[PDB]
Amino acid sequence: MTRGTTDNLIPVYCSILAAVVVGLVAYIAFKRWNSSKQNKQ
Amino acid sequence: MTRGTTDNLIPVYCSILAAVVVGLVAYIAFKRWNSSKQNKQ
């Protein structure tokens, strides 16, 4: 619940990283699925 | 480069977490876009 009682701060790397990762995969996944084919992943 | 010579170990929480997060958002995003509408995000 407290997670180190940092209240959004300490976990800056895991937060910024996870964000870029999620969004990134979404930008490519949502784009590739927008119309692009798979052709053997 | 070595990061403790553990080769993917310490960052088990950030790894497992980021994974579930990314995939999750993808399962909902890829599903909602599969046909579901937005109607004001």
Curated annotation (Swiss-Prot), chains A, B:
Reproduce the UniProt comment on modification after translation.
Subject to intramembrane proteolytic cleavage by the gamma-secretase complex, giving rise to an intracellular fragment that is rapidly degraded via the proteasome.
Q: Where in the cell is it found?
A: Cell membrane; Cytoplasm; Perikaryon; Cell projection, Growth cone
Q: Changing C14A does what?
A: Alters mode of dimerization, but does not abolish dimerization
Q: What is the effect of changing G23I?
A: No effect on dimerization. Loss of dimerization
State which residue ranges cross the membrane. 11-31
Tell me, in a sentence or two, what this protein's role is: Low affinity receptor which can bind to NGF, BDNF, NTF3, and NTF4. Forms a heterodimeric receptor with SORCS2 that binds the precursor forms of NGF, BDNF and NTF3 with high affinity, and has much lower affinity for mature NGF and BDNF. In response to proNGF binding, the heterodimeric receptor with SORCS2 activates a signaling cascade that leads to decreased Rac activity, reorganization of the actin cytoskeleton and neuronal growth cone collapse. Plays an important role in differentiation and survival of specific neuronal populations during development.
Reproduce the free-text note on domains from the UniProt record: Death domain is responsible for interaction with RANBP9. It also mediates interaction with ARHGDIA and RIPK2. The extracellular domain is responsible for interaction with NTRK1.
Q: How does it assemble?
A: Homodimer; disulfide-linked. Heterodimer with SORCS2. The extracellular domains of the heterodimer bind NGF. The cytoplasmic region of the heterodimer binds TRIO. NGF binding mediates dissociation of TRIO from the receptor complex. Interacts with RTN4R. Interacts with TRAF2, TRAF4 and TRAF6. Interacts with PTPN13 and RANBP9. Interacts through TRAF6 with SQSTM1 which bridges NGFR to NTRK1. Interacts with BEX1. Interacts with BEX3. Interacts with KIDINS220 and NTRK1. Can form a ternary complex with NTRK1 and KIDINS220 and this complex is affected by the expression levels of KIDINS220.
Q: What is this protein called?
A: Tumor necrosis factor receptor superfamily member 16
Species name: Rattus norvegicus
Residues of the whole record sequence present? 245 to 284 of 425
